[PDB]
Amino acid sequence: MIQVYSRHPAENGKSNFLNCYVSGFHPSDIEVDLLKNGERIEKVEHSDLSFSKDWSFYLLYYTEFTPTEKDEYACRVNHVTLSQPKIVKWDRDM
Numbered sequence: 001m002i003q004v005y006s007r008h009p010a011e012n013g014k015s016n017f018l019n020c021y022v023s024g025f026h027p028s029d030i031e032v033d034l035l036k037n038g039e040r041i042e043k044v045e046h047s048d049l050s051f052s053k054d055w056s057f058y059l060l061y062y063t064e065f066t067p068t069e070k071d072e073y074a075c076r077v078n079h080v081t082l083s084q085p086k087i088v089k090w091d092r093d094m
Contacts, residue, residue, distance in 0.1 A: 002086060003088065004021070007019055020061055020077075022056075026056045027050055027056060030078065034075055035087065038074065042063075044063035069093075071093065072094055
């Protein structure tokens with residue numbers, strides 16, 4: 001599926017980057033977003049590099065986060081094969 005992590009330890013009150021790996025899916029025809037309990041964060045930027053058929057060797061996107069006792073962070077991915085994108089939530093509040 002998807003395996004999310006962070007670049008640094010979860011410190012309640014810091015801003016830092018949410019890391020969502022998506023591997024095996026040629027970047028050209030997939031969709032991935034960074035969420036909060038199924039809510040689009042939005043401050044996320046990675047531009048696809050498809051060109052033609054593309055080559056998945058490392059897909060990652062990045063968004064500003066601040067962990068709180070209330071908010072859960074998830075990363076959603078969809079491909080033509082799936083009829084529904086999947087959510088992977090980061091172990092700290094799930």
